[PDB]
Amino acid sequence: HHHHHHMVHITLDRNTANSWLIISKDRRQVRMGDTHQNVSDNKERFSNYPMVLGAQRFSSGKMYWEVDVTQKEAWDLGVCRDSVQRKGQFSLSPENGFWTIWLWQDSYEAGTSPQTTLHIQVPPCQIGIFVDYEAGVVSFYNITDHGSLIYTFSECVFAGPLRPFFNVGFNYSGGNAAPLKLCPL
Template identity: 25%
Template structure:
């Protein structure tokens, strides 16, 4: 398992890093960060460490405005065009997890993904205390969502309570990038992308206001 930290010099001014740069939260108010050539104008952040060889990491996400990405360090930082946004260029790949579907974007081409419920492998180290009543149709695992939430009248609150864990695996020699949905002692394959690596890859995240990402 790779140990990763977020690079504060890349963090957009509407992102707040915490937990020794292992967690990021999107906020509406701009922060007074110093100017830096590596800082994104888009609400994105890159990790300090690259991933090479064979590397696996997990992320816990809260909220529905998160993109889980890997990117070359050469991605543009200034401006709001496709050249800067994760998944919208040939420098990056991005997984979007909504309440009922997945999609992956690379070079501005979005592909909707189907999840095979039978595609599970054993996962060691995920808590057995997670809710055992998850619906099989819920491809992303909601952890810690209160049963007291108003299911029909509080859509915004439902989005805030939407918590899930994703695993990412890079195999440089095989040229693969894989995403997994992690739950309890299992994880299910979401998608494997074939990549011809031309540079080291860096994990990164787009995080909108009210959403957050934590490196596990």
């Protein structure tokens, strides 16, 4: 791919974070805390899962960013509608306003309904996310494997402004504490 020149500087929005997340001072890293992080509740916060949104909203153009997933066992990444449900239980699907991939129990899957198996030969340490708003495309790239394509959502019906979407995943196992990090441009 040759999408690197649409690079955007993403920062995390504290106010959208699950109350157990710890976001770094620079707003570029997020990890699971071992307890509630002593913040007030609000209608924006994801309640059921360890999720947070980027601050940036996109309604046009081409955008690209990279995320470090080194040594994590579980995570979700992609984009979502600004209007997605925050409270209670829901599935990650385009019908619910999410265009995502994930790692879970040693398999990679795209968040279609039902989910799609991904064929990754080189487990990624960094993931590239490309959005073309006008084209209706969200693509995922394996930066560890020379930028190889992971998955393309096409014919997307965004139906609103998009936000970068993150899930650090639970840490029941003690093997998933590592952060998600937004990688430098």
